[PDB]
Design a protein around this ligand. Sequence first.
Ligand SMILES: [Mg+2]
Ligand SMILES: [Zn+2]
Ligand SMILES: [Zn+2]
Ligand SMILES: [Zn+2]
Ligand SMILES: [Zn+2]
Lengths: 55, 51, 901, 203, 65, 50, 76, 388, 221
Amino acid sequence: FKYTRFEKARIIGARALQISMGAPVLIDVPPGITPLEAAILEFEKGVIPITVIRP
Amino acid sequence: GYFIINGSERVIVSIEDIAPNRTLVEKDERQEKYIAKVFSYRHGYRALVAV
Amino acid sequence: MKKVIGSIEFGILSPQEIRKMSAVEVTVPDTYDDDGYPIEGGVMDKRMGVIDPGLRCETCGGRAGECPGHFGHIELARPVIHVGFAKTIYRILESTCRECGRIKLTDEEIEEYMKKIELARNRRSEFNEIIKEIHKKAKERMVCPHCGAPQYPIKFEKPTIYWEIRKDEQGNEYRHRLMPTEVRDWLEKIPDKDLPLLGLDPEKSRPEWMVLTVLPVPPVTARPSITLETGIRAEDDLTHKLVDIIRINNRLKQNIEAGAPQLIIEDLWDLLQYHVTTYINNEAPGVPPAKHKSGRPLKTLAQRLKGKEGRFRGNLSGKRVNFSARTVISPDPMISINEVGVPVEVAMELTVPEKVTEFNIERLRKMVLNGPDKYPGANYVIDPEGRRRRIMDSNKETLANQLDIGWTVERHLMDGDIVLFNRQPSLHRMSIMAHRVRVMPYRTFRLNLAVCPPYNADFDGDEMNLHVPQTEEAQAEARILMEVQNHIISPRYGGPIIGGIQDHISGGYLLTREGAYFTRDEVEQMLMFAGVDITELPEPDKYDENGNPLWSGKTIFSLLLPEDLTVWYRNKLCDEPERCEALEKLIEEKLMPDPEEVRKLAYDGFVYIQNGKLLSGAIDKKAYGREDGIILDLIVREYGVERARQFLDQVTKLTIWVITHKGFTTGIDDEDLPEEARDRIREIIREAEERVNKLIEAYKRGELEPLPGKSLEDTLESLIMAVLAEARDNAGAVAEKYLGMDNHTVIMAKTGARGKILNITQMAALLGQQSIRGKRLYRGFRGRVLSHFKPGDLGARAKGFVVNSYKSGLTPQEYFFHAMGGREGLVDTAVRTAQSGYMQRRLINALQDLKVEYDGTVRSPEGIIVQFKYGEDGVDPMKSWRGKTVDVDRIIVRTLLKMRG
Amino acid sequence: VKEVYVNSDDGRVRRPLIIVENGVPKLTKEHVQAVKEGRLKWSDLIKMGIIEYLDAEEEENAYVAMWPWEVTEEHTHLELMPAAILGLPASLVPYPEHNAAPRNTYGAGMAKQSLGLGWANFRIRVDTRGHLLHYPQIPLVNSRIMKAVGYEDRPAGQNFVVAVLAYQGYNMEDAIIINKASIERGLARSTFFRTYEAEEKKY
Amino acid sequence: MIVPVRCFTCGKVIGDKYYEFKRRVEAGEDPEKVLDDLGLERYCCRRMLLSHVELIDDIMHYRVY
Amino acid sequence: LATGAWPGGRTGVSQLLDRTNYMSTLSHLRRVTSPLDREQPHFEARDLHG
Amino acid sequence: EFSIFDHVLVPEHRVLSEEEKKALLEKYKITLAQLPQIKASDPAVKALGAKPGDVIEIKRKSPTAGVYYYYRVVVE
Amino acid sequence: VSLSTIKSLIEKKGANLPENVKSELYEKLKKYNEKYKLTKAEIEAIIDDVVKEYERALVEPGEPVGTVAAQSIGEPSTQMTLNTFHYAGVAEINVTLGLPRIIEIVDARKNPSTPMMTVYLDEEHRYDRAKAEEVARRIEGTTLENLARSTTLDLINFEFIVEIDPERLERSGLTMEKVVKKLESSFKSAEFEVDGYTLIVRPKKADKISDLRRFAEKIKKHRLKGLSGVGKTIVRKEGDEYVIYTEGSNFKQVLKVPGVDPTRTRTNNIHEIAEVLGIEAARNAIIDEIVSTMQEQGLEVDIRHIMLVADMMTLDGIVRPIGRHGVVGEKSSVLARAAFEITVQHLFEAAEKGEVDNLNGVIENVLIGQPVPVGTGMVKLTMKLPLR
Amino acid sequence: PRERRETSVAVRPSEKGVVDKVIITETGDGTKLVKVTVRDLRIPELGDKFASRHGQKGVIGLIVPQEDMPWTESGIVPDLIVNPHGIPSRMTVGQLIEAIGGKVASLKGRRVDGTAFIGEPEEKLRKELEELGFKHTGREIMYDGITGKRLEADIFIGVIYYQRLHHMVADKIHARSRRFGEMERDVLVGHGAAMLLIERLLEESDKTEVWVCENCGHIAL
Ligand SMILES: [Mg+2]
Ligand SMILES: [Zn+2]
Ligand SMILES: [Zn+2]
Ligand SMILES: [Zn+2]
Ligand SMILES: [Zn+2]
């Protein structure tokens, strides 16, 4: 299994939206960063709750 | 050499046109039809006569 | 709770649906009324919805602006033929029996046609062809195969009049008009099983419903009264047509219930039919267009849709989108390739909404304290409920102490934000990319120079647009999908498209040129300028005369390459193939020769890199150029995108530094030729002119052989053009021979940085023949181009052959000929843009729906399979090396070297 | 075809030429001296049959000599000044025969769109928008036609000390690098005008 | 429109030497000798005096109050 | 005379004079135009004639 | 004597049997109407015994993958 | 390592690879093994690396291949020249090049502007210039005008003496008696008093100048020997054999000419290829034509985009123009077609047919206001709620 | 009114300057009329367009302090630096000849005639320049401004007429807070970005919510 770049983009978008809305961050982040790089770091660490469903 | 119209400077650009009252022959390439045409000017009226 | 429309299936409404779907039965032709209030039973009822302010909808109870409107129905007194379905009705009548109503066709024909229709369902054109064939076959028949009853011919009169040509007892043919009730009765008896052959679906479109019995009324929002400048409630054309329809319907009904004669009933029936037809379509064929109160044709339902600016063809458009800016661009190589410089004033307007959380509360607090004037500030703050406020200076001190989780701040642009970048005309995919913001003073969109090729931009007044995505999903899409890093390899040919252009090549050649050495100061300065992380210089190579250490350029360049890169190829400077042959022999013999041996055999025409050390060759276009960037391609495809970006961002600065502090120029003496070369060129020109004159004399005296493709004159012209072109090539060869490599212009041409050899030829030796549309110059006076030549002259000099280079200067006739050539070139450039644009538009409209499914197949929008395993191998052109799926040669060599090292 | 054509109508574009007979041009040294002293005018030269006007039709029978030292017995006319075949803006370019034609066309366009003191009337003139260059200068290398036309009295542009050299990569792809102190001292400084109109319209 | 006070390139003051140069050249002296006498060796300074136009007189006649 | 549009179908006969500088004005006073359609590629008419 | 299949521009054609036809149809989750179509008047069809409603397997010579299979259905 | 072992290892590990990939891998592995004495570990590592690279190079689902192909075809055309040239070669036939050629192929015009056929030779006639000229004569389509050195059309006394050159007669292989016999066998109602090396004609006692002029031009361009619609032929020598280039288009007739190798013979007109060899041949010819046109201008375009375009064009047996005449004009989506037309009858036809719009395109989804089903618009996301 | 409403005339939003002249007068039908002229000082800045007489255009990319400019052994500090790569592809030899001619004219003290074909031949200019004490190729030795060392090559330097066009950046720049087309839509589709297309095109206040029945397929109420 390998994430296509479209799947990765959608996962990052959804995670960033959830973080902005008020969801807790699963990892510690440096202060003064926007939700987007927070989600990017979350993905880079490999800690992602969202999963994709393929036909 | 220009005009003042409502306070704005207007210039008339010369227009290059076909010589009146001269027959010019030419050939098409789909009707294989030799034609000749001439424009006749008479008091500001241009008439296209083609044989 | 929010679903997405997956499909839309079209059909024909049934009268029962129209009855139950509608709410109010409109019966009275009532207008807005004097007090502007909806009259009960009028066209604009309150059950239809309200657009007037200060009242509530009857059905949904919504105020104007929130009530979507609701549908109403009109109960027609007599059946009316729909204008659009008139031709369909006429076709159907000619195909069905007058008595039974079934299709006049044999059962075997029915089976065959059903099979063919099942096969050709998807193809719309073939389906229409089959329908027309069946219609012709049925119409040609005369006796019903089921009943045997005669079928009197049916004649169609536009727009909605049908005549049945019947034969009396005397055999005379008389036209019997079919009333709509007769047509309905005919259509009802048609069974469901016959509909597919007739071209119908017996679940969404039944023939009886084509004839209208109930006419739905659009809601008030669909037919709003736009009012007038005088305050007069300027009504809708649909409203007026509905009023007339209601009046005529009531009149027809009251005369029907009064036992009126058949003639007046027919008159009112035809008036109703005409009004209905003009209401559906005011431009229907054979229909007089109804005039407005001002005498103009009323815009009706048909006209409201088939408009270029209407719902169709109008919603798709290009308008001023929000959060955009446009300004001229200026270059700067001090920023990374994936960065863009934004002026402060632009950054203080294109705000981006950011929701305040726990890990960014203090930054947003400082920003909102800055106000809308200091650069790191904000312009609008949105409370969790939803109201928006302007920060200004009155409440600047507050709105920060009361700012907590759940608020939204529209801060200014800051470094690191993602931003799109566009250049029109937008031809290929790479014309829009995502960059990172870097706010700098002045007012220009600073752009790195390596990114110029994909944008096809030059800094001579070109302008660019940037758009700032607002939502988080859009920002993530731009950051992950659209960044400049991911688009180094072009999808078109599978090679690089981002690389050095002009200085990045020439300066690289200067740095890696054979015999180029640098002192310690220059080495340290250039390494620090390039950003290369180093803390100790390598061992010096060769010592200066007075004792200072020196470093060759090759080692300095090798400090940038990765630690295990290994490649070899031939560049454009290879002029002595024997040395390349010897080097290739050694390399192939060993696959890892001792670097000492390579040093003696070094040659700048043969690049060879061993374990990240440049051992031989010089940098030119083939290293990291616009195309054929062997090293850059290798870095991209083997060490990831980020490593490639770092390598590009370092080599660009290194090369720029070396060319800036080493000196590079060009003067008028760059194209000065020795006397011997000038004499050679002169004698070449004279000999060519003599041969041309000999050809002309041979033609004059009848000594010429006309090849079959051309007449005598055309053969003469072909020979003359060939002779002149060969002469120009010989002169160019001489000039190139006598021009050394140390010349800066020759360096620029040879390395491929800028210009061609033809440019040097034209500037130094000879300009050459001038042609229009591939032919010698001929358009001028009778028998001569200019007036300074004897008439009927075909010599080379007299028909566009110019013998002076740019350095020597052109004589007036040569100047005129050159002007002709340049004008032709400009015209071609002007026209080819439009032609290519038209072709691209056609191709995109044809092909913009295809996509790769999850099983690797490519399917047409209508479901047809276009290609199994896209590309017949499944390889993305971007991922392909240069067209080949896998470059197994490089794989073999790289693996062998890595494991045998 | 044995046809003779005579034209006496409007709109024909003609050019002047020097009549040449028997290999000797009609124009002589004393004529040039008289014109130099102001005793003779262009119309006088026309009326004495020294210079003739030719339209495109009459030029069919002509055989023009480009230069005064190329005239032979076959020639019937001598070109007056071959440098005058160019238009007005195109004559501004110096050494136009050492350039490719597209570059000359571009240069003519830019010369048409450059700033400078166009008219001394600008202070009191009312125009939608205008510009004024602070310190215009005569071109150091300039065609002699420019003085005759009058361009020198209303110049547009300045002379720059230019060095061809790559510098920091900030002038790649047609960009240029300009010296700060020169800008401070007044180089290329200009002013932009705009006029707004308000009318007390009676209704 | 009036003579620049300082040379654009090197900043040398040449504003006061223009009228002297013009009057001397009109008298028939060699322009090169006059420029050398005035003390302008770099051609950057000589260009300012050689290529200047005095348009202030031409534009002085129209007043605006 | 304002807005061009001579009677008889001709349009753009009169244009606003250009006052950008000396050369622009003097060149605009010496312009010659052709009535052909701009869109159609009149290859024979566009090119320079001897 | 000359058959069209010997030409370089003509790849080999073959007629599918019922079992393989249905296996192919099930593999791509499609119906017969969703495949590309070849007319019954095509010379390749005439050279074969193909009849309408049948599936033709085409063995292309691909510049990228060498061998590649394409399928078409026969119509009027 | 015996070559059988390399083949077995290739089949064992790289079973997923395409046939060309594994064949080329086998060839180059054999060469490098015989040159450098590889062992099995290196071979296994190499095959694993090849497999990993091929897996990485696969395209991912959701990629919008159609738009990318359209852009990658359209963009180079802007840099490509725009006709307005007359390449006058000697041993060549004039052929439309560049943008007009691309447009003609894309729009599938019924007859190309410059039809041209490439005819190869069988083994017997391939390796000799003289036999090539003989086959040319069989295919030359020789005309009296080409044979004639010059023509004298003297209407003042009702005759027509055309001067025939001996060299052209010898090249065509026809003799004066032979050509006169063929002409009279064709022009039965004429009298040919041929003398020497000149033809003499009379139009059965005509009266007016125009009649004899028309009769003379009728004979002048009349065909004598050769297949219909064929002009000049230029027998060249490419590689080692002689190949006969030829104008005109008679692709079905030429295949029956003796000495002509029919397997390699090609023609410019794609429609003729469709008629004679089938539809797959038409697709391959389209691909080759576009590739050659792109190559002559120096531009490089990946073969995959051209393959996609060609496959899309010949989707239903008959070659159709890709434009609105044959492809866009038959778009299934009634909404997409709606913003391309001037009438509304298409809506009524769709409603009558019960057409279902699948919203599988781009324009319809854009108009509605919904994510386009390409790329990120294809994926669906789910999450297990209990979170740390 | 169509109380009274304001119809005052105000300057354009993206302009500034100083009022220079105000005149009051009467129209042709007796109504009062005023005109106001606003002047603005525009010092050159990044993005301003410059072009020579030989069709060589460009915008200034950097304003460098004087001490960083390289100087010449004769003391000449260039006022403008152009890239050598622009010459070979354009073949504007007239530019180089004009540079030499300007140098010669400045040194000699009289202007140089460049009247097309009868102008001063370039070889005469080169000879005169050589006689005046400079290299006949127009090249000079220059020192680097930053390092202070001597540049390795000899740099061509001269005087060239330059004109400033009115395409100035202060008039081009404008940004909208609260252009696109079909080609951009195709590009965005080609990238695979869909939510970006929705955000950039649809935006907000033009989309609405509609209840839909899942049984029949009609708009629910
Ligand atoms: Mg540009
Ligand atoms: Zn409501
Ligand atoms: Zn019946
Ligand atoms: Zn100075
Ligand atoms: Zn329902």
